[PDB]
Amino acid sequence: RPRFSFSIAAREGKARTGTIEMKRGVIRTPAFMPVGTAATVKALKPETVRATGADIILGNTYHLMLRPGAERIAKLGGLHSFMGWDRPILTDSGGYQVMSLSSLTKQSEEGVTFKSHLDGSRHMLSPERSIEIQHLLGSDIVMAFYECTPYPATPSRAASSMERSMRWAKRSRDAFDSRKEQAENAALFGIQQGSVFENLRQQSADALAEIGFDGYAVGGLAVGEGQDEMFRVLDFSVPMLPDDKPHYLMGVGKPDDIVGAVERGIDMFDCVLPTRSGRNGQAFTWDGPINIRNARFSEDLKPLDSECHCAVCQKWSRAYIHHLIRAGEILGAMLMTEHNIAFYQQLMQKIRDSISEGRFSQFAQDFRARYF
Ligand SMILES: [Zn+2]
């Protein structure tokens, strides 16, 4: 019923489990959010996405602004109504894609100018335009617009980029606050930057807390630094964010990354891996991933995973799915994606249950021992 309410029901070390109550629904944390790129979680009906256990999905402001257009979607009744997903949606601000998929990007204090990577150039993105688009889409959790710091990054480079983003966070906060409908029904998350430097990260955290947000995302990771660095950064970074607010680690998703991130205080995750690697033929299992295309699965009657409770593992064999993927059949992508998202959600449920029971540390250890 409330606009936004985060409650921690249990803790173990830095790990915690709880819920986020929003007008469109309850989000159980730690949470994994499936990625919905062009108003669709690839190869899945929204009801299937919900069936796997997902309480919230992520939409991106970049793609949607290009096709079919933020304004068009608003006119159509909003993203929820448009795609058939009635639960909460967290929208990325588009800053990282603007820099990864756009042609001739132009950075400036006002924002970034760019050329759409597919048809001319739906051109401008600033802190206020981003928030505006996110309002048009009707997202429940709005991400403040930021400027990306590549890896590696020199201290001065990381400092100046972090500083710009902190200014953009203020502008995003204000833009969000000026729109009453948005401010009253949605949530706004701020994003910490600072690369791998804790002084920078600290400054970013402090700026962010000064402005004040509903949740804090740890940005700049999973950009090539490797798990060791990521974890090392998380170790000093997460404790800098407000304890009573959710901590969201953007773009992080290998199963082992998630478990280690939760051990360091992360409550929310998103990643294209499960969907992406699904179309590719890679299925996640409690014994590590398997590539279903491999000839040894040609007559394997066992399900993708022997303990998985998803509809795919209850009804189809590795042999069939192996066939479908090798034949390039659409059902192959559909079945692989559903199992993978299903697997991710079961991992989050296992994580949440072990924290509530005070046995997460052992779960993590056992998980790693078997998965690897
Ligand atoms: Zn399954």
Side-chain angles (χ1 to χ4, degrees), residues 284 303-305 307-314 335 338-340 342-343 346:
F284 293 97
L304 260 9
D305 180 86
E307 296 176 6
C308 179
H309 62 65
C310 86
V312 181
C313 298
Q314 304 302 287
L335 260 37
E338 182 176 351
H339 156 78
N340 278 171
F343 177 87
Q346 282 168 90

Side-chain angles (χ1 to χ4, degrees), residues 142-144 169 188-192 208 213-218:
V142 178
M143 296 300 291
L188 182 68
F189 278 25
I191 309 178
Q192 184 197 229
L208 248 35
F213 295 88
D214 295 303
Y216 299 79
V218 176

Side-chain angles (χ1 to χ4, degrees), residues 59-81:
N60 2 171
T61 296
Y62 178 64
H63 318 268
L64 295 168
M65 126 173 78
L66 301 184
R67 303 190 305 191
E71 275 74 18
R72 171 165 290 169
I73 286 172
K75 185 185 302 175
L76 263 23
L79 190 49
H80 294 83
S81 165

